[PDB]
């Protein structure tokens, strides 16, 4: 039925966001870490070549996030990407630099050219995680958008409105998340001084993630009005104006308070960073990568479940808040897209595992010398 399809597609959107974080987040974090853990040309190339073979396929997870939002939640895709217009332009512009940095950095034997492309990679690794965090924090604050009766969307805010302390904290937490992911990927993919510096950056990023996640939870609980869905037919048509919403203080905690089993997701988000650090200390970067992955899973699903059933609450028109029951595509579209996803995501996952398997190996100075002209 329609309701089950919509809830499965909510699950799928969250899964795609988590997989984006897991895969492309370590690319972004390693780009952020590049000036931290690489201090000469060889170290820089080792760091860049730790993700060169896979970063594009990983980024397809962000592209799929966008396309699955379009296909399954067209209202969310529309309202969010138009409402965060300047933020998205900034993300896109930073993202430009990554394919170009990766391919072109070694194409000119000029220190200035390599510096330009290293800086561009850092920009394209830094800006998107920060803006995504700011965007999700603004979701929790409520986004100043509204629907007309004909469901045309109106935005009443601006880019500067987003830059309030709670969304800034969320952006900082998202940055810490990608930096932790990239630090554990550098742990599994490099040796030597880069490995040491990425380890220390991993500890610092995990501490940042834990502090920011705790502060944001406290802030949500005590000083952010939540939204409550009073009445909405979950098998009904995707029309946000056919529902009843209330904005009560502390309401964002309702899902977890009512259902104590849902508390595991914030527990994963908060404690999986500590377990990632423990694994890194235990000499186990594979378990560390798993723990960092579960941190991404827990944090993102914590944000979703806090918002559930809302996906995009509206600070100026609460009835215009988007839910998983009213933001979706038709039943036919949800069904067929689910079938297609269930066929191909397993296949994509298997051949992505295959590619990572064939390419598994630590990028080192000797590896770089052996293949200097081939590598990025």
């Amino acid at each position: 039925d329609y309701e089950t399809l919509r809830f499965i597609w909510w699950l799928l959107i969250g899964v795609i966001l988590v997989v984006f974080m897991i895969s492309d987040g370590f690319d972004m974090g390693i780009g952020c870490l590049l000036p931290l853990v690489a201090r000469n040309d060889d170290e820089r190339r080792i760091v860049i070549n730790s993700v060169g073979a896979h970063w594009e396929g990983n980024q397809v997870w962000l592209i799929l996030a966008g396309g699955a939002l379009f296909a399954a939640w067209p209202r969310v895709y529309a309202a969010a990407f138009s409402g965060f217009y300047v933020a998205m332009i900034l993300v896109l512009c930073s993202l430009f630099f990554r394919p170009l940095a990766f391919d072109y950095r070694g194409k000119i034997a000029d220190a200035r050219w390599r510096k330009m492309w290293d800086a561009g990679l850092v920009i394209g690794s830094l800006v998107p995680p920060v803006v995504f965090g700011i965007a999700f924090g603004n979701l929790l604050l409520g986004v100043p958008f509204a629907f007309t009766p004909q469901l045309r969307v109106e935005y009443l805010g601006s880019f500067w409105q987003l830059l309030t302390p709670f969304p800034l904290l969320c952006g900082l937490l998202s940055l810490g998340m990608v930096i932790l992911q990239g630090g554990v990927w550098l742990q599994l993919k490099t040796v030597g001084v880069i490995h040491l510096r990425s380890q220390l950056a991993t500890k610092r990023a995990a501490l940042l993630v834990m502090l920011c996640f705790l502060l944001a939870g406290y802030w949500l609980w005590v000083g952010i009005d939540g939204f409550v869905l009073l009445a909405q037919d979950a098998n009904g048509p995707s029309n946000p104006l056919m529902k009843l919403v209330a904005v009560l203080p502390g309401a964002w905690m309702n899902n977890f308070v009512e259902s104590p089993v849902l508390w595991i997701f914030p527990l994963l988000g908060f404690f999986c960073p500590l377990l990632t650090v423990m694994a890194i200390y235990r000499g186990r970067p594979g378990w560390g990568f798993l723990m960092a992955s579960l941190m991404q899973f827990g944090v993102i699903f914590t944000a979703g479940i806090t918002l559930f059933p809302f996906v995009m609450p509206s600070s100026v028109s609460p009835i215009s808040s988007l839910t998983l029951w009213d933001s979706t595509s038709s039943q036919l579209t949800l069904s067929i897209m689910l079938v297609i996803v269930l066929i191909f995501l397993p296949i994509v996952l298997l051949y992505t595992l295959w590619s990572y398997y064939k390419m598994w190996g630590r990028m080192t100075t000797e590896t770089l010398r052996r293949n200097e002209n081939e590598l990025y």
Binding site: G57, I63, F70, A78, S82, Y85, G236, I336, I340, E374
Partner: protein
């Protein structure tokens, strides 16, 4: 400038920029597949070295292609939020399926192509190159399925409860005749582009008496592949012409050497009625006669939405407003006519070039006549010229429609200000200028250095 016009020009520029690099990817990757196949069959290392050199040029083009694609993916949401809402139930599906089937395949395995030369054995690397080729072409399939649906919306119905177009049959989307011919024609054009690329660079080598053996073989591969490609391009172009003749009277009028204007006035009338009924439906009316009238008039909601722009009072539409919308229903036929002509004429020039190159190839006299090499060298821009002409015809000839007879472009736009569009345009244009200069420079430098520098 109207912010809607800034958004139109932004999508214009960014799609055009993206498709400066896509056609080369589409054709060149199959050329690399052929080079690696020949290497596998014969064991001749020169074809492996050719794969690596031409693939280095491929990577240079591919990086900008990826970045420009990134701009395009989210532009639908950023600048066309109403478009996204109104048609996402159908249109977001081919984009998602592109991501799922094609983007994952090509992006995942392009890294194996460039960096798996050693970790993969000869057959696995050949398979990986073929998978990159098929992934990029399947991405063509799905994105062009979306674009074709924009040209010929099929298997969709308006839902009163969600105020949007909804899917009715997925198969009518997947086998949209327009999307089929669009896919095959565009990928044939990409094959032409890659073939002409390697032929022109090889001809430049042969004119300077350098890289002779690689240049000869690369010219031969390009000659055969691009002869087949340009022939298929022309045939599928005639197929595309036939399909748009069936479903798009405007593009049919363009090729005819330039009725519908007059026809649009009854459609405008029915559309005004449908728009009034749809405003009633949005207001929550469900009276039976209202819904029966709307079911009778829902095939013209697009023309009503078009009329909305030229008539602020939809209840009382003066004849002047009717005529403004009448004129605005038909785009300027001259850009479309001249686009079609460049595309077709450049195709004829390319066919002549490919046939002469193939004759010299089959005779084994590639380097015999210098004028053959000079013609091949000077023919390098022609595929891009014809391709941008074809896409200009495609995207200007459906104007004013974002979805033909469903969603006007002027109604598909987001709620943005000329300040935000100025920011996005300045940033995108400046960054793209820098990127294009750098990419043309690197491409020129490494093509000039040639395979011997590898």
């Amino acid at each position: 400038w109207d912010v809607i016009d800034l958004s139109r020009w932004q999508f214009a520029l960014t799609a055009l920029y993206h498709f400066l690099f896509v056609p080369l990817t589409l054709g060149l990757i199959f050329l690399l597949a052929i080079m690696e196949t020949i290497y596998v069959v014969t064991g001749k290392t020169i074809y492996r070295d050719m794969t690596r050199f031409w693939g280095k040029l491929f990577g240079i083009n591919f990086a900008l292609g990826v970045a420009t694609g990134l701009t395009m993916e989210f532009q639908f949401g950023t600048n066309w939020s109403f478009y996204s809402n109104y048609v996402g139930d159908i249109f977001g599906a081919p984009l998602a399926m592109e991501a799922l089937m094609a983007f994952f395949l090509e992006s995942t395995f392009v890294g194996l192509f460039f960096f798996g030369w050693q970790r993969l054995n000869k057959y696995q690397h050949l398979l990986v190159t073929w998978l990159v080729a098929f992934g990029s072409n399947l991405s063509a399939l799905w994105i062009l399925n979306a674009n074709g649906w924009m040209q010929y919306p099929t298997g969709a119905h308006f839902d009163i409860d969600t105020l949007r177009m909804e899917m009715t049959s997925f198969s009518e989307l997947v086998f949209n005749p327009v999307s089929q011919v669009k896919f095959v024609h565009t990928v044939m054009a990409g094959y032409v582009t890659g073939a002409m690329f390697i032929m022109a660079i090889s001809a430049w080598y042969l004119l300077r008496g350098r890289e002779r053996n690689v240049a000869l073989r690369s010219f031969a591969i390009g000659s055969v592949f691009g002869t087949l490609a340009i022939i298929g391009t022309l045939q599928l172009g005639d197929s595309s012409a036939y399909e748009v003749a069936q479903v798009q009277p405007v593009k049919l009028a363009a090729m005819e050497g330039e009725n519908l204007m007059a026809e649009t006035y009854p459609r405008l009338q029915r559309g005004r009625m449908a728009w009034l009924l749809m405003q009633e439906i949005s207001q929550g009316n469900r009276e039976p006669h209202v819904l029966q009238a709307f079911r009778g008039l829902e095939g013209d909601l697009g023309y009503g939405m078009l009329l909305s722009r030229y008539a602020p009072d939809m209840n009382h539409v003066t004849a002047a407003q009717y005529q403004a919308a009448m004129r605005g229903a038909i785009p300027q036929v001259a850009p479309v006519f001249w686009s079609f002509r460049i595309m077709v004429g450049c195709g004829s020039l390319l066919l002549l070039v490919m046939l002469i190159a193939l004759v010299q190839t089959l005779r084994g006299k590639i380097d015999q006549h210098r004028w053959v090499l000079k013609m091949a060298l000077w023919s390098l821009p022609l595929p891009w010229i014809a391709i941008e002409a074809g896409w200009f015809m495609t995207e200007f000839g459906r104007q004013p429609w974002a979805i033909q007879d469903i969603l006007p472009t002027y109604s598909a736009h987001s709620a943005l200000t000329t300040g935000q569009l100025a920011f996005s345009l300045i940033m995108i244009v400046g960054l793209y200028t820098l990127f294009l200069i750098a990419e043309v420079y690197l491409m020129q430098k490494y093509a000039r250095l040639g395979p011997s520098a590898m």
